[PDB]
Amino acid sequence: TNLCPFHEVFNATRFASVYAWNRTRISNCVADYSVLYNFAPFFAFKCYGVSPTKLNDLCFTNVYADSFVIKGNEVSQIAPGQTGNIADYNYKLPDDFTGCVIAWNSNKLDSKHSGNYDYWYRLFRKSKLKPFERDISTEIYQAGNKPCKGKGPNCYFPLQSYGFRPTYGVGHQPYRVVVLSFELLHAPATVCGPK
């Protein structure tokens, strides 16, 4: 038997800042969801268009896994038909989606005294992002009708930091989120459930 590498993305130290969320393709392996309880039994399990029970006897071609870190209040923006800075400028799901969302608390892991400024996010952009889009631009944003000539009036840096602390309220503590997308295509299936 050959198991999937799930244990990697759930045990890594760095967790792919939201503004540069990483994507990994899982194929040709058996998905065992019982290992998730090793990392965190307490989970925020939730799925759309599918149930975890019927998911055990289905097959798929490729599975995409996305990961990033966000606050607790912004976890509600990760869903179809939602709005906000994160949903509009960092990561947007389509109106029609089939997958599951996982979230767990990681305060004592990522939080640190004096602030952890290693995580960044975007809040300014000219237009909204399309479903499953990524942008790593670093150019200054123009708010006025004048040309950009460096930081200054009406010229703001499009990136900012969170600065998590261990003494933060539960609403501001860091949360690690994982998104699983199931895909089907006219090719031989490679992922199925155990027997």
Partner 1 sequence: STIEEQAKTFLDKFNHEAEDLFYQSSLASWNYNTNITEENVQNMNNAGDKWSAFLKEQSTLAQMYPLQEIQNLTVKLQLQALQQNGSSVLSEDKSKRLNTILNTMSTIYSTGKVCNPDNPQECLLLEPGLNEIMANSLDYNERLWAWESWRSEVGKQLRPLYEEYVVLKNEMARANHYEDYGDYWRGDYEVNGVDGYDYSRGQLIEDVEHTFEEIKPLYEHLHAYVRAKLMNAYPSYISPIGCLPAHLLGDMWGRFWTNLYSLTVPFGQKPNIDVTDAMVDQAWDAQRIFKEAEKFFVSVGLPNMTQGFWENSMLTDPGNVQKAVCHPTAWDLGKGDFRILMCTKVTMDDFLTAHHEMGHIQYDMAYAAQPFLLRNGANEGFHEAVGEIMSLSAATPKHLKSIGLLSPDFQEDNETEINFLLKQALTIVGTLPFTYMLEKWRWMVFKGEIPKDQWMKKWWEMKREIVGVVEPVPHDETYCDPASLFHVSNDYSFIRYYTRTLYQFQFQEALCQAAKHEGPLHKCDISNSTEAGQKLFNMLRLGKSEPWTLALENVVGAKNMNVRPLLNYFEPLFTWLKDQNKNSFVGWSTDWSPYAD
The residues of the shown chain that bind partner 1, judged by CB under 8 A, are 115, 123-124, 143-145, 153-154, 156, 160, 163, 165, 167-172
Cα separation of 77 and 92, whole Å? 9
| Nearest distance in Å: CB 87, partner 1 | 16
- Closest CB to partner 1 among residues 97, 156: 156
Q: 99 vs 158, which CB is nearer to partner 1?
A: 158
Between 112 and 165, whose beta carbon lies closer to partner 1? 165
Please state the φ and ψ torsions of residue 112, each to the nearest 5 degrees: -160, 145
In the complex, the smallest distance separating the C-beta of residue 178 from partner 1, rounded to whole angstroms, is 25
Cβ–Cβ < 8 Å for 91, 83: no
Q: How far is the CB of 92 from partner 1 (least distance, A)?
A: 20
Instruction: Tell the residue number behind the tokens 């029970």, with chain if given.
Output: 53
Contacts (Cβ under 8 Å, ≥6 apart) of 13? none
Q: How far is the CB of 109 from partner 1 (least distance, A)?
A: 18
Nearer to partner 1, 97 or 124 (CB): 124
Q: What is the DSSP letter of 30?
A: B
How far is it between the farthest Cα atoms of the chain? Answer: 65
